[PDB]
Amino acid sequence: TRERLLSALEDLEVLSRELIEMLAISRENQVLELLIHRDGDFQELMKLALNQGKVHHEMQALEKEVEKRDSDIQQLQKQLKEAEQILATAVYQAKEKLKSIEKARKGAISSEEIIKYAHRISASNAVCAPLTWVPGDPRRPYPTDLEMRSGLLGQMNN
C-alpha cells in the first residue's frame, strides 16, 4: 500500500516542518509525536520495500511458470484436438462404410419371389424390362390401362 506509506511520511514531514517553524519563531509532546510518526513511517517504508521486492520476484517467477505451463497445455490441447478430429473423421468414414456393408449383406432378394414375379409378369408389360426401357420410358408398373383402371379394380372394386 503505497498510499498509506506516502500519507504517513507526508504527515511526519508536515509535523517536522511545523515543529521547526515553532522552534525558529520561539528562540515537547509535538516533537515526540513527530519523531514517533517519522520512525513508524521509516519502518513501514522498509517493510513495504521488502514486501515489494518479494512480490516482484514472486510475480515474475509465477508469470514465467504459468506462461510455460499454459503454453505447453494449450499446444498439447490443440494437437490432441486436431488428432481427435482426424480420428473422428476416419471413424465416421469407417462407420458409414460398415453401415453400407451391413445393408448390403443383411439385405438380399428372394429367388423364389423373383421367379414368381417373372412367371406372373410375362403376360403383360407390368414389371418386365423392355429393350428401350430407360428412366421415364413407356414402361410402367401397372399391367395394362384397361386391365387396371377399368378392370376389376375400377369396375368390381371401384
Partner: peptide, 19 residues
C-alpha cells in the same frame, strides 16, 4: 493407427516444449 504414433511424437513435442 500409424498416425497415432505421430501423436505420440506430439507427446515428445510436449516434452520438448516444456524446456
Amino acid at each position: 493407427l500409424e498416425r497415432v504414433i505421430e501423436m505420440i511424437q506430439n507427446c515428445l513435442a510436449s516434452l520438448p516444449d516444456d524446456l
